[PDB]
Every structure is written in C-alpha cells, then in structure tokens.
Design a protein around this ligand. Structure first.
Ligand SMILES: [Mg+2]
Ligand SMILES: [Zn+2]
Ligand SMILES: [Zn+2]
Ligand SMILES: [Zn+2]
Lengths: 155, 170, 130, 83, 134, 669, 258, 96
C-alpha cells in the first residue's frame, strides 16, 4: 500500500488493520492510542517495524539503544567513534539517576522572591526603623548621614 | 591589582527564606569569597558590594530542598605574573635569601638571585645584606622582577630576582 | 601553556581587565568599608589578608588624599595598556631610559619628552600633596 | 541553548497542570519539612504536606515553574497566576 | 565473631537439649576453627528468625569422613490463621478471610454451626457440580 | 535526595551529557597511579601484608580497618582506583580488533594516506555525503577495488595555485598495498600478486600489531578526520593495547572461608596469569635466543588478554580455568543475561518494601489498605524534624521500635545513626530542631501497591495504609478487577515512599480514586462486583420492603449521614420502606440517568430499565448494567461529576449498605 | 483531538441520521404561515421588532446546515462518537436544578443564545494563541466538538424542546466551558507509554477468543493476535495475505453480472 | 531483603508520570551512591570529601570539579568499560 497508494494512505491502513485485530469481539478501543501507534510507524517515511527491540532506528546515540538491548557491540562499536548523547533520552536518563523528564519531571522550579519581598506589610515605624544607638556603640541613621559611593568608583 | 567581575553560587537553605533573602545571599557571598585565593584569579581582596551586585536565579534542588542563587559581583583581586615589577616589604633576612612580602602574597628572593655586592652579615646587630653602603635589613622595601610563579592549592608562589638594572633597595 | 612575562602576554581575560591603581585601589577599599559599617554591630574580622594590604597600602600611599587620586587621573588619560598604566603610577621616577628598562613593552609605544613632563608633575604632586 | 520568554507574551496554558500541582506540593513539602518560613496562618497541622496543601488552596505559596519549550526557551509562572 | 546469640541455650556439649523453648535467631550448635587471644573462629549455624517453637530431638553420630556429626530437629505447631490456604478436592483454591467465634456464625437450626463457609460465586462459573454432589 | 557524608565540596550539578570516547594508552597510564610488576601478586610476599602492584598501591581498600590513602573511608564511599599494566609486547584486541581488520585499505602501508584521491572526486565525495560513523561503507568498497598506489600526492605540475593547484593525481604517492586479506581463525593472512613472475595467494603470510600501530600513528591529522575517527576521542592508534588498564577490586570479588583460607575470583585470577606470561616474555628482551621460539609464548598473551574480554570469540580457544569451563569474562557480565543490563540497570530489587498474601475486607474505604503491625513495625519513612513535630515526634522515640506508635533510628547533623535498638534504648537525647528521625508507618500515610504482572497503568496505584492485625494485606473488593487476581493465596508487593516529594506524587496523581477511570477506554475500571453486586439486585427489587426496625440499623453506613431519617414510602398499617428508597440514599444528589433498555413502555412495565433523578432512583432495578464499568455507567457518571468523592464514598456506601443488608438477607446456592 | 482520553464520554449527533424533511422541522424557522414560537417567547415577544431577528434565524441555519452536509462527506454512517464533556447531560441534569415546565415559557431571547455560543465556543481554546494563523490549528482542533454545540443549542431547539431561561442557560454554558478546559490533556506527559500499554491489553483479550473454541471455519479466515506480530514485523509472508476489492455497481449490484 | 522492581513495573510509573517516585525507587532506595567527576575528562577522581582534596593526575586539575549521583550499578559499568579501554566522559554542565 505504501508502494502503490500514499504514505498517508498507508497510515489509515494500519489504523484499520489494528481495529480489526482488537474489536471482534467486544473490545476496549480508544481511537487516540491507536492513532498514536500509527503516527509513530508512518512518521519518518518508510514503515518502521516494531520487532523485539524497538524500531530498528538509531539517531539518539548509543546510551539510549543500550537500553533496548542487547547492549555490547553497540558500545563496542559506538566507542570507536565518540557518539555524543544529548541524554534527552528517558531510559538513558533513568540509567544515570538524573531526574527524568517523565511528565512530572519535565519542568523545573525556582522561587517567587517577588512575593516574599513586597509581601503584605508591614505595620509600625519609624524610630526603630532608622536608628542605631540603643547599645551598639556603632551608629547609623537609616542611610543618609552624608555619604555616597559609585561616582568615585567610576573615576 | 584588578577590579573584575566574578561569579559564585550560593546554596541557600529553606530555614533562611524569610522576606529578606537578598540580604542573606549577599552576606553569604562576602563570607565565602573574600579572603580566598585561586591560581586563576588570585587573591580576592574584597567584593565591591552594593550596586555592583547582581542576584539572578534561582532554581530549587529536587532532592535537597536547597535553592542555588547565581551571583555576579565586582571584586578587587591581586594576581601576580612572571615579569612584573613590584615594591615589596622585607620581613626577614637569612643567609638563604630575602623573605619579602607584597600585600598578601609572599615573595622569596633567593640569595643566588641577589647581586654579588650584597654580602651577608650575621654579626651585624640585625642580620642584614649590605654591600655597598646600601643596607637591606628587615625594614626596607625592595624592587624585584618576578621570574617565575606557581600555584599550589589555590595559593600562589613565585620567585623574584634582583639581577636587572633599577632593582633592589628602594 | 602560558607562563611568560612579556612584553604584555598571558591570560586573555586578565589582559582585557584593567589593572587597578594602588592609591586609588586603597581609596575604593576604604569606601567599601564605609558602606559596610553603615549598620554594623562592631568587630568584623579583617582576617589576615586585610592586615597585610592595610600595611602595604599605607606604605605605598602614592596619594594620601581623596583628591590626589583625581589629580593623578586628570594627569593620565591615554590608556595604552592598563597594566603599563597602573605600573607607571605604582613605581614613579623618573627618566625615560628607566621607563623602558622597567617596562620593555614600551619600546616604540611612546616618546620621551612627554614622559619627563609627566614625572615632573608627579614629583610636585607628591607634595604639594597638601 | 536557552532564550527566555516575555513575561508579557506568554504562550502556554494559564491553568496549572496535573503534574505541576503534584510537583509543587512535593516541593514545598520538603521545604517546610526542612523547617521553613510557612506563608499561611498555621491551622494547627502536623504534616509538612497537608500544610503545603493549605497553602496551595490560598495560592500563598512561593516557588515558580519554568516551562521549557522545544525551542529551548522557557516561561516562568507564579503559583498565584496559575489555575 | 558472633553476636545476638544467645549461646546461653547450649549445654556443656555445645549442643541444645530438647525440648528447650527456642525462638528468634537463637543458636543451637557451636563450631571452632584454628588460625593472644588466638585463635577460635565460629562456623556454627544459627536459626532463621522466621521460625520458632521447641526442639523435638537431636542425634549425634559419627561420619567417615572420620569425625563427629550432629542433626537437630525442632517442632513448631502451626494453627490456622487468616491468610492460610485451603481447597477441596475440586480445585476450589481458597484462603481464609476471617475467623468468626461461635455465636456470630449462623447457628441453625439443628442447630449446628458451619466449620468453614465458601461463597456461592465460586460455583456457576467454575462449574464444579461435583463439589456440590459430594 | 538523601544524605551522603555531607560531601558539600564540589557543589553538585547533575550529569548533563555523556561523552563516549576511546581510552588511550597515554591517558590510561596517566590516570593510573600504580605500577603492577608482581604479576603473580595476591599478597604472595610470604606474609599477610601486600605489595607491590596488586592489592595495595593503593588501591581502594577492601575492609574496614583500612584508609587506602587517596580518599575513603571504606568499604564504600571509596571507588576503585584504576591502574595501568605496562606491556612492552604489542598485544592484540579481539573486539576493537575486528574493526581494525575491516579497515585495511584506509591509508595503505606504510605511507599512511587515505586510499581515495580527489579523485576519483565522486568516490571520495560520495563517502563524505554521509554522516560520520557510517562513511565506513565507502572505505570498505574502495579497499576491495584497491591494491596499488600512483604518483605522489597532488603536487601541482604544472605548478600553480590561484586558485589551485590541480595540479594533483593522485591519492598521494608510493605503491601499496596491493595485497588483500582474509580472516582465518585468530590470525590474519594475505596474498601478494601482480603479476606474472612470482607472488602469493591464500595460504599464509601474517602481519603484526606493532607494525599496524606504527603506520596509524603516522596517519596525517587531516586524514584522521577524513574518516569516522576522532583525533580527540577515537584514534586508530588506540585500537592497540599497550598500557592495559587495571580496574580496582571494587569491580571484582573475593571471599574468605574464615578461617584458614580466603580465595578470590575467578575471574580476575586470569589477570595474574597474563602478567605471568608477560614478565617471562619481557625479560628475554636481551635475547637473542632462541628468538624464533620466543614468539610461541608471545602468542599466549594474544589469547589470554582476549579470553579476558570475549571467552568465546568464535575461534575455539577454550578459556578453561577450572574443570575446562569458560573463564568468566567481562563481556559475560555486561550482556548476560543473568547479570547487569536486565537485572542491575533495568529491574533492580530495591528496599523499603514488602509483600504477603492478600485477603478481602468489606469494611475499608476504597483508597484504604490494611497493613499488619508486623510490617508497620519495620518500614519508614524518614521524616525531618519540623518545629511542629518536636513534641509529637519525640513521644514516638520514647515509646520504642517495638510499639507500633514508635520508631527506629535517629539521624543527626553530622550524619550519624543513633540506632534505637540495643544501641540507644535510653539517653533522653531530647531531640534536635533540624535533624531527621525515622518513624514507623501509621495512618495514610500513602503507599503504593502493585501486582506482578503489571500491565495496566493501574497495577500500581496508591492507597492509605493503616494498619490492622493478622499477617495479610486487607484490600477492597471493588479494587480487585484492576489487579486481575483473586485471593487464590496471591501475593502483592508494597513500596513505601520516603522523601516528602514523592509522597506527593503518589497522592495527587496516582490514587485508587483518581484511577477509577483509565483512558485506555475512557470507561471505568472498577465497579461493584461479586457479593455486593449479587446483593444489589436482590434488594433493589420493589418486592423488598424494609421494616421500620431498620432501616435504622442500616442507616449507620453512608458513611456521611445527613442525620435525617428518610421520609417513609408507606404510611399504611405498618410503616415500610422500599429497597430502592434507602439505596438511592448512598448516591450523590443531582445525577441523572435514562437507561432505557430493550422492551420498555410508557408503563413500568415490569421493573424494566433504570432511571435516577435528584440522586434518587425511581425506575427499574440495579444490576451490573449500571453499577459496573458500563459505558454511560452510573459509576462512570459520578466521576466525572463531581470527581472522586463523595465519588470515592460511593463504593463505600453501597459496598457497605448492601453487604449489611445481605448479611441478614442470606444468600446461597 | 487535543484532549485527555481519560475524560471522555462517547456521545451522539442528533443532527445526523435525520431526514432533511424532519431536519427542517427542528431547527429552521420563518414567518411563512408559522410564528408558532411566539407562544413561547413569553414573557415578551417584541413583537418581531425590526429586521435583525428575522435575519439571525436564517444565518444560524446557514452554518447548522453547512454542518449537515459535512459531515457526512467525511463520516460513513455511524453517529455515536466519543467527545469531551457530556453535553446531552449538562442539560439534564439542568432541567432538575431549575425545573420549569412547558407552562413556563422562556425568559430568553433568540439574540442571546446565539451570542451565548459564539462567546463560549471561543472560550474553548486549546492551542494558544494568536499569533495569527496559529488560531487555525485551534479553530478546527475542536471543529467536531463544535458542530455539537450548534445542534443541541441552535435556536428552535432551546425553545421548542426543553425551554431554558437566562439563569439556566447562563449556567449551562458555564459547566461546558469549565468541563472542557478540565478535559484538556497535559502537557506532561507520556501519551505513548500509557496508550501503548492499553493497546497491549486489548490484543491479549482477542488472542484467546480468536482461538477459544471455536472451530472450524472457512473463507475470510485470518486470525487475531497470532497475526499482530505479522503487522508489527511488516513481514512479507503474512499467512492470510487476503485483500478485499469492491465494485461500482455496475458492475455490479446484480449477481450474474458480478 | 529486598524485593524486586521489574522492567514491567517501571514502565507503569512512566504511564502515570512520576519522575520523582521513579528516581527515588531506583537511584536512592537501592544504590544511593555519589562520586566526584573531573570537568575536562569525565572520570572518577582522587576525591576525599574530607580534606577537600580532589586533584587529578592526568588533566592536572585541582580547582575545576563537579559531583554526580550514579548507582554503584552505573559505577561498575563505567569502570568495567575502563578495562575495555573506552572512556565514558561524563561531561556535566558548562563544566565541560
Ligand atoms: Mg482462575
Ligand atoms: Zn580509594
Ligand atoms: Zn602508499
Ligand atoms: Zn581529569
């Protein structure tokens, strides 16, 4: 069908030919997941099969492949060429212990310091606010006793 | 001496999130970098805190609970290089050389690198190296020309000579 | 790899950076301390690095004043080579022939007459200095 | 190769994702569990997480989420922003 | 080396005497292998904690080989407890789910009480009309 | 993430990229800091010490009382310290050997200059028109057609360049080359013809390693890149071993029949056998004699250093170490199976887990799991000391690790474990205000439960422990379908989370409740089944009235009761309640259904069909049609309006009300 | 689709398997010897006011009609399909919450229900944003779900069948919007892993059956599971290579011609 | 102990989407192992995590370092690779 119709044609062919496998009779069908298997097969042109190993591809370095097994050769060969692995992999990743991009690991977090800063008041002032003579021999005065900075630095 | 921009990461702990983190991050920075030394940048005299202090980030750690705050800062550093002429302050004088001292770095002037006009006198009140009227004791900044420097354990150490013209007693 | 003296040679980043002056450096340090004290309990360990600098800086105060530095700056101008600059203002004295010896990298960089004029201004500035 | 995105021209969905809720609550849990500045009147809880949830409900919890795009760019979202 | 004994249960013979209540990781025999204060090793065998109960009997004979040779047997009653397997002779693999005391159980009307009671849904689908007949 | 000797130092920064290179003799030597001149080492110094070049130097320690200088302590935290093993006897290399053999014709001996010319501009260009690590195909094709040289490089002639010169032709200069090669067993043979005056075909004529390496090293730098090689990571001149590295014991094993004895593996041993065969060959360097016989022993290093890699490289070597049995090689462990790969990298055992036989219980909420004390008294579940816990959390310790509501271990700042067992068992040791303490498990307290084989997304879903006695896992019948497994004495595994950040995942995403509807089919996967189901029918019948006498009794399940007793449907002589009435009680308020089965009329006509209103049924009879994983299933319909719970309560109500009805209704066959 | 499998309920298109003759008797409206709605317009008719209304009524059907023809032109004949957010239910229960029977005519206005949608279909976005042209992937990444909302909320429908009122309707269009965005899947996520697992379970359910017992048979033969591997292996030798070829007719619809 | 966390098993976390549970039940609750990597040639160092002495007899490093979490599982393999003369350089972040 790929040789004589479309490539798009042949996708529809899969979808149909898989339904006819798990439906007769009374069978748990979801058009969504069926849909996905097909697009994966016909998403790179040729019909990528799924034999006990995982689409005989090869574009994500070795580290990853080593997971699909069987390792060996792969490393014994890839080594002789220094194959860079962006480690964008998900099994390559659960191999190193780095946190994997498994959905809930597919994002990072920081902190909204902004909230902690402007955060609600705030209710008092002012004396204590800008002082420095309640014991600490040292002085202060908020910050305006007659002194600059930068300028000099620039010069 | 140089005024340069350096980086440093501060790994803060939940206990100190409060509402004035900015201050904490700055306080921690001054403490971790000031006084330190590296072969790459040398002695980190001090950090030009205020205005010249950037606080980017940060991203909290997954399995730790600590957040990493990258910080860009301006600092005064003292890095020496072979061939540089500097004024130093003599500290000790032994029949082994001249234990000078420039700022925070220690410079050693091997006796073999000292003119043949400065004989070593151990009998003289305070061990010195006169000639030659010129008397270099434990109190006479000399001029030397760094011949070689080394960096062993963040610390730096080099040797200077007095063989060229316009070097020596100051 | 790179462990020469030159002749202006060595680290690229460091080369790029501008060598801070002695007197000016000390002034900036002082300024920095003043800003920190602005609200201190008292103490603030100066470690060991501070002590040394505090001494060397004072023992080399080529401009014991807040204006001296500015005067020096005014006198200068043309960059040429950050290093050479800070070096010339850190040594002092005096003649051309001597300048080349100390800074061989000056070879055919600058003339003489001019140099002499600068030295005279510095000698009078050191005090002056009042 | 990042790129950063305009806090003004954000693309992604304004709502907070199934997975994120799960990661945030996971994250503050550890934080508070680690004696941390709790940002809402302590109801009188014990569970470093059941507390974090008290926070989430009131959207009074720090932490932001950087959503990396395929490009390599990202977006930052505030817990109070999200839905 | 050897801790968490206790060897307090071995006789002068270095072997246990039936029927001493043995439990835990208790030990029952003792070994020694030469190499101040040196040297005695310990290649003696303990008792898996997962087991308990007393000691039926021990039999000490000779091997050839040409040394001594001991065998220890311990008994451990086992009662039915929730979670034990039972099945009839028709492949009604069953497990105990609960243990009701005499009053609760359907005392009727003769009035006896069921010793065990299986559920009716383990019939029609597994068609096993023999279990019934029996 | 846990603790690891508060290493601190080098911040952290997780691994981001992985660079796969090809070790190099030079590097192998530098990296290694040991010697290794005592081939038959094994502490064979006449005592029980060590040295020199096997155990010590340094290497990485093997027991407690040892601080193997360089790091520590032991036995862990101290990784193996690789080391070089000189050589000075050109050695082969099976694996990488195969490739090196295939090349033959990628530079020609010995000038070492790419075969192609320019060239031949298509051949050379075509080979490049393909990403690296593949262009090999082109090279092999050229070698099969090659076998001779030409003039000398592309040196002008006429001389010029603007922009020239071409000026060239071809493929440098020399001759060859000219003789192909074939693989016979573990030896290389080639013929040399032209011809027509004298040559050789397929019979004999070998080569060597020292010769090949030399030629490679000569290879031009711009040439090393011309092929699928890396003048930085992979360098042909590396295919040949010279400083054979030596992994630290950490990678190997040992043993000790304590006492008298302490054999090793096994394995390794061979490694010592190889140095035995090398030192006896290196000492003869001054000879000389017999010379021709010396090569016969050199062939043995060609075999041993191979058996160490590929026991059976398909040549008929044997590699018998004990009783003529393959010598556990390095390639054996990698891709076993029965080893790493799929046993030490994919499916790893794990800890903080347990399993036992399952049992039924009708009395647990859906998201509930009965955990026997026996286990609860052995789990955890760290939990840092909050300022909210100190008092509460302390009580646990003071209780003991043998009292459910107790704990084991107390972790401190320095990272030291205060075993509550025999160790502690006292010392008020108040309780820090920032350290960690490991407790027992107590009340959901979520934990995840699976059943091997776990096909469906939901063979691992998360429950809430607590906590019953007797030694099985009580779980909820309506949850049995997802685990496609009855109580035939089955086992099910429990994995307890530790960190408070996962405890969150398996609470907010994975939960028997939020997993009652797999997207496999956008249909429910759990529903009323077995006795509670048989019961529904035999009780949703409008033949079954309820005596006022209870009602009452059965109202104590709901479990969240309005408190108000339902308005009676029958006020006639006795006050009676219909079986539908009190059932429709445990259904949410405001869910509608119009089932409309086959034959159905304006009439009833006869309890045929089903239809609910403001959370009250009025029509037909409840069976699997409606309280089972049906399409527009009632279970489906409150899930999905209004989410799990009171949704989660639905299974608790009916599966509690009805079971209670059935108890006194009796049923059997 | 753009939606999370797990939140979805097969649904039905009333507007499909209908005779054009009865189609018109459900959606179309006119002033031609009709005006039967005025009996419901209560309270408040207008009446008919000035143009506009008369015009909205034929414009609604221009699109409710471009939907009747396409589909079909796309879907064979089936009608039951799985969409997000059960609409057929948000209306009941909804006529439980507010009730109101035929006796109470609609306090609504034909110029509202039509705005109602347009404002709350354009609230169902799943691809963001605009970013012009990027609004296209979205306009038809919900196009199917859309023809529903113009078929169960088209004008004549909300006044003839199940009379609604401002409050009810305003609340209906409420839950929809909400239940929709609550149905948008991910990001995340892992749509292949979960989907792949579900695809495996189904096969296991067939394998057995395709063999069970089970004969015994002929023609059409092929088998299940046992075949699966054949498809995934794209192997040439697939036992039952079969192949179905259709005809015109003619030829044929007859027999002896065939 | 212990138990056993099958390939099968792990494929199921991934379905839900639990980065952290997954990571916890493979690189923590079994092989909690940490090592220190050189930034140029990503390999085991002469680390001491006590006297802050790291050093590198090869790349000549003493200031540039980074830490990595790996399963002793992983550890072995990388080491076992060293015996086959191949160097998995763990080029971390910018530390490259
Ligand atoms: Mg069975
Ligand atoms: Zn070590
Ligand atoms: Zn040649
Ligand atoms: Zn290194």
């Amino acid at each position: 069908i790929l040789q004589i119709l479309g490539i798009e044609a042949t996708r529809s062919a899969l979808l149909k030919e898989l339904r006819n496998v798990i439906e007769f009779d009374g069978s748990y069908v979801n058009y969504r997941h069926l849909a996905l298997l097909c697009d994966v097969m016909t998403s790179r042109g040729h019909l990528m099969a799924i034999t006990r190993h995982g689409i005989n591809r090869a574009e994500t370095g070795a580290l990853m492949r080593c997971s699909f097994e069987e390792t060996v050769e792969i490393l014994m060969d890839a080594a002789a060429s220094g194959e860079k692995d962006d480690c964008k992999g998900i099994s390559e990743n659960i191999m190193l212990g780095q946190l994997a991009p498994m959905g809930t690991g597919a994002f990072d977090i920081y902190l909204d310091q902004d909230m902690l800063m402007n955060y609600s008041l705030g209710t008092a002032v002012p004396t204590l606010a800008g002082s420095g003579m309640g014991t600490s021999q040292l002085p202060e005065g908020a910050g305006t006793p007659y002194e600059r900075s930068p300028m000099v630095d620039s010069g | 001496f140089f005024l340069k921009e350096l980086s440093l990461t501060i790994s803060l702990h939940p206990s100190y999130f409060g509402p004035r983190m900015q201050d904490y991050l700055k306080a921690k920075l001054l403490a971790d970098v000031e006084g330190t030394c590296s072969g790459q940048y040398g002695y980190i005299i001090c950090v030009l805190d205020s205005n010249t202090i950037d606080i980017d980030k940060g991203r909290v750690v997954p399995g730790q609970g600590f957040a990493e705050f990258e910080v860009k800062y301006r600092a005064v550093l003292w890095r020496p290089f072979r061939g540089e002429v500097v004024d130093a302050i003599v500290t000790t004088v032994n029949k082994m050389g001249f234990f000078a001292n420039i700022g925070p770095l220690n410079v050693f002037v091997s006796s073999h690198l000292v003119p043949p006009d400065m004989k070593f006198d151990p009998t003289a009140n305070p061990p010195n190296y006169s000639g030659e009227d010129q008397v270099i004791e434990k109190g006479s900044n000399v001029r030397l020309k760094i011949v070689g420097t080394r960096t062993d354990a963040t610390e730096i150490f080099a040797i200077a000579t007095m063989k060229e013209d316009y070097l020596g007693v100051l | 790899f790179e462990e020469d003296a030159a002749q202006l040679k060595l680290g690229p980043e460091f080369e790029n950076e501008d060598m801070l002056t002695v007197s000016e450096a000390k002034i900036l340090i002082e300024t920095v301390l003043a800003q920190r004290a602005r609200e201190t309990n008292g103490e603030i360990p100066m470690t060991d690095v501070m002590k040394k600098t505090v001494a060397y800086f004072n023992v080399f105060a080529r401009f014991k004043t807040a204006e001296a530095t500015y005067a020096c700056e005014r006198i200068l101008g043309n960059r040429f080579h950050k290093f050479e600059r800070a070096q010339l203002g850190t040594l002092c004295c005096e003649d051309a022939e001597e300048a080349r010896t100390l800074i061989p990298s000056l070879a055919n960089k600058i003339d003489d007459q001019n140099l002499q004029g600068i030295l005279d201004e510095l000698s009078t500035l050191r005090k002056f200095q009042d | 190769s990042g790129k950063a995105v305009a806090k003004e021209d954000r693309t992604t969905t304004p709502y907070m994702t199934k997975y994120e809720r799960a990661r945030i609550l996971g994250t503050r849990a550890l934080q508070i569990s680690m004696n941390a500045p709790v940002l809402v009147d302590l109801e009188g809880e014990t569970d470093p997480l059941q507390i974090a949830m008290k926070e989430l409900a009131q959207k009074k919890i720090p932490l932001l989420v950087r959503r990396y795009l395929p490009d390599g760019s990202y977006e930052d979202w505030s817990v109070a922003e999200l839905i | 080396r050897m801790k968490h004994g206790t060897y307090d249960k071995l006789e002068d013979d270095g072997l246990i005497a039936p029927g001493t209540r043995v439990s835990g990781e208790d030990i029952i025999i003792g070994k020694t292998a030469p190499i101040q204060l040196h040297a005695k090793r310990d290649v003696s065998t303990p008792l898996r904690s997962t087991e308990s109960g007393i000691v039926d009997q021990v039999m000490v004979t000779t091997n050839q080989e040409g040394l001594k040779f001991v065998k220890v047997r311990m008994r451990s009653t086992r009662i039915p407890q929730i979670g034990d397997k039972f099945a009839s002779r028709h492949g009604q693999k069953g497990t105990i789910g609960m243990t009701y005391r005499h009053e609760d159980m359907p005392f009727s009307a003769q009035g006896i009480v069921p010793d065990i009671i299986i559920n009716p849904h383990a019939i029609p689908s597994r068609m096993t009309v023999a279990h019934l007949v029996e | 993430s846990g603790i690891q000797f508060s290493p601190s130092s080098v911040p952290l920064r997780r691994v981001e990229e992985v660079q796969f290179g090809i070790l190099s003799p030079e590097e192998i030597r530098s990296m290694s800091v040991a010697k290794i001149e005592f081939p038959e080492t094994m502490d064979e110094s006449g005592q029980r010490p060590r040295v020199g070049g096997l155990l010590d130097p340094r290497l990485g320690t093997i027991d407690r009382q040892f601080k193997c200088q360089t790091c520590g302590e032991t036995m862990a935290d101290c990784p193996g310290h690789f080391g070089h093993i000189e050589l000075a006897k050109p050695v082969f290399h099976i694996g990488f050997l195969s490739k090196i053999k295939k090349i033959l014709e990628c530079v020609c001996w010995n000038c070492g200059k790419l075969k192609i010319d320019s060239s031949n501009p298509k051949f050379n260009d075509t080979q490049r028109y393909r990403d690296p690590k593949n262009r090999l195909n082109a090279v092999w094709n050229v070698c099969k057609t090659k076998m001779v040289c030409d003039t000398g490089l592309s040196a002008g002639s006429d001389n010029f360049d603007l922009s020239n010169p071409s000026a060239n032709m071809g493929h440098g200069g020399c001759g060859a080359a000219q003789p192909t090669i074939r693989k016979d067993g573990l030896r290389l043979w080639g013929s040399w013809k032209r011809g027509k005056d004298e040559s050789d075909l397929p019979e004999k004529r070998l080569l060597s390693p020292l010769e090949v390496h030399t030629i490679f090293t000569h290879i031009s730098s711009e040439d090393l890149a011309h092929l699928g090689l890396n003048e930085q990571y992979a360098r042909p001149d590396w295919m040949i071993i010279t400083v054979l590295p030596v992994p630290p014991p950490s990678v190997r094993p040992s043993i000790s029949v304590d006492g008298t004895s302490r054999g090793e593996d096994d394995l390794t041993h061979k490694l010592s056998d190889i140095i035995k065969a090398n030192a006896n060959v290196r000492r003869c360097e001054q000879e000389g004699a017999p010379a021709h016989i010396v090569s016969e022993y050199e062939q043995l290093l060609q075999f041993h250093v191979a058996t160490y890699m590929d026991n059976e490289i398909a040549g008929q070597p044997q590699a018998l170490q004990k009783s003529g049995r393959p010598l556990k090689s390095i390639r054996a462990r990698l891709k076993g199976k029965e080893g790493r790969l799929r046993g030490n990298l994919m499916g790893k055992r794990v800890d903080f887990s347990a399993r036992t036989v399952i049992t039924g219980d009708p009395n647990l909420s859906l998201d509930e799991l009965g955990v026997p004390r026996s286990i609860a008294k052995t789990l955890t579940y760290p939990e840092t000391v909050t300022p909210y816990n100190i008092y509460q959390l302390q009580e646990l310790v003071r209780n003991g690790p043998d009292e459910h509501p107790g704990a084991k271990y107390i972790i401190r700042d320095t990272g030291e474990r205060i075993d509550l067992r025999y160790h502690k068992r006292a010392g008020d040791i108040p309780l820090r205000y920032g350290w960690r303490v490991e407790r027992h498990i107590r009340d959901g307290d979520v934990v995840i439960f699976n059943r091997q084989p776990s096909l469906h997304k939901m063979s691992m879903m998360g429950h809430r422990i607590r906590v019953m006695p007797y030694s099985t896992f009580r779980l909820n019948l309506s949850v049995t379908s997802p685990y496609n497994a009855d109580f035939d004495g089955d086992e099910m595994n429990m994995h307890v989370p530790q960190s408070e950040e996962t405890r969150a995942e398996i609470q907010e995403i994975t939960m028997v409740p939020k997993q009652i509807v797999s997207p496999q089919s956008n249909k429910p996967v759990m529903g009323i089944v077995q006795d509670t189901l048989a019961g529904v029918r035999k009780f949703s019948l409008r033949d079954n009235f309820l005596t006022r006498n209870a009602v009452m009794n059965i109202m104590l399940w709901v479990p969240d009761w309005d408190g108000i007793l339902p308005p009676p449907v029958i006020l006639k002589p006795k006050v009676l309640w219909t079986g539908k009435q009190i059932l429709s009680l445990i259904i949410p308020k405001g869910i509608n259904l119009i089932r409309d089965d086959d034959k159905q009329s304006l009439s009833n006509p006869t309890d045929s069909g089903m239809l609910i209103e403001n959370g009250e049924i009025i029509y037909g009879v409840v069976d699997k049609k409606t309280v089972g994983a049906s399409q527009g299933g009632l279970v489906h319909t409150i899930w999905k309006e209004k989410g799990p719970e009171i949704c989660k309560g639905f299974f608790n109500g009916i599966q509690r009300v009805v079971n209670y009805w059935l108890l006194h209704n009796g049923f059997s066959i | 689709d753009g939606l999370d499998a797990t939140l979805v309920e097969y649904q039905v298109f009333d507007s499909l398997r209908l005779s054009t003759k009865q189609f018109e008797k459900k959606y179309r409206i006119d002033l031609m010897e009709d005006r039967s709605l005025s009996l419901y317009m209560e309270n408040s008719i207008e009446n008919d006011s000035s143009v506009q209304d008369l015009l909205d009524e034929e414009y609604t059907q221009l699109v409710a009609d471009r939907e009747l023809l396409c589909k079909f032109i796309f879907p064979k004949g089936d009608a039951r399909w799985p969409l997000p957010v059960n609409v057929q239910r948000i209306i009941q229960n909804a006529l439980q919450i507010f009730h109101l029977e035929a006796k109470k005519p609609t306090d609504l206005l034909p110029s509202d229900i039509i705005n109602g949608l347009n404002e709350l279909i354009a609230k169902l976005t799943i691809f963001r944003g605009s970013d012009r042209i990027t609004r296209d992937v979205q306009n038809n990444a919900t196009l199917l779900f859309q023809i529903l909302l113009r078929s169960k909320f088209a004008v004549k429908r909300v006044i003839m069948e199940y009379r609604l009122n401002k409050v009810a309707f305003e609340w209906i269009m409420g839950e929809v919007e909400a239940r929709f965005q609550q149905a948008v899947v991910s990001p995340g996520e892992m749509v292949g892993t979960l989907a792949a697992q579900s695809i495996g379970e189904p096969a296991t359910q067939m394998t057995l059956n395709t063999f069970h017992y089970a004969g015994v048979s002929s023609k059409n033969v092929t088998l299940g599971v046992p075949r699966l591997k054949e498809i995934l292996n794209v192997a040439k030798n697939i036992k039952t290579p079969s192949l179905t070829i259709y005809l015109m007719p003619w030829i044929a619809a007859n027999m002896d011609l065939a | 102990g212990g138990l056993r966390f099958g390939e099968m098993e792990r494929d199921c976390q991934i379905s839900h989407g639990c980065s952290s549970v997954l990571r916890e039940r493979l690189f923590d609750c079994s092989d909690a192992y940490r090592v220190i990597v050189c930034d140029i040639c990503g390999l085991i160092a002469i680390a001491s995590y006590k006297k802050d002495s790291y050093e590198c007899r090869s790349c000549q490093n003493r200031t540039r370092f980074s830490q990595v979490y790996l399963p002793y599982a992983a550890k072995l393999l990388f080491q076992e690779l060293m015996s086959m003369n191949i160097a998995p350089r763990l080029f971390t972040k910018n530390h490259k």
